[PDB]
Amino acid sequence: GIDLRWKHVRSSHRKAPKSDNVYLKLLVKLYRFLARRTEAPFNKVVLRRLFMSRINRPPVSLSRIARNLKNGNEKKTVVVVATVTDDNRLLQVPKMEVAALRFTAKARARIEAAGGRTLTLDQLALEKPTGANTLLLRGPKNAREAVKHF
């Protein structure tokens, strides 16, 4: 027998999504290929966020995107691996280029009316396969009733 005071630890992160969405499976395959065949850390981060659950992917609103577009970030492509929602308190939507898992109908309409573009993550993989000139955004994770009552 061997004295192993320490213990080998199985991985404590997701290696695959629990979701049965077939299009999500196709995105997972594409970004597995990208994260294996490229050196860019962006693809690995996007693949990890594709694995995640919904409470780990809070929505990002247009006002949050507009806040993060300031200070030299106006021309960058916004990437959100979550749903992009509309904020009706934001009266003027700036021109922007956003890639997201999904958009609400008002968010997509307001971006197109302001003159920007909405992309899917596979269109993002086509145009920026290394994630160049991208602004990666996350929503507020702790902004949840469960987290407040923790």
Partner: protein
């Protein structure tokens, strides 16, 4: 085995019976080997043994 000899053997990487390691002689290691003398046999190896 008491916790201090157990920790010294773990730091010497002698985790299984009939495990052997090479050790550079300083006071800092000589005292550890003196503590774990009830469980180990040690000595000065020659070029053939190496």
């Amino acid at each position: 085995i008491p916790p201090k000899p157990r920790k010294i053997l773990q730091l010497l990487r002698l985790r299984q019976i009939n495990n052997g390691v090479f050790v550079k002689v300083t006071k800092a290691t000589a005292e550890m080997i003196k503590i774990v003398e009830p469980w180990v046999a040690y000595g000065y190896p020659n070029l053939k043994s190496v």
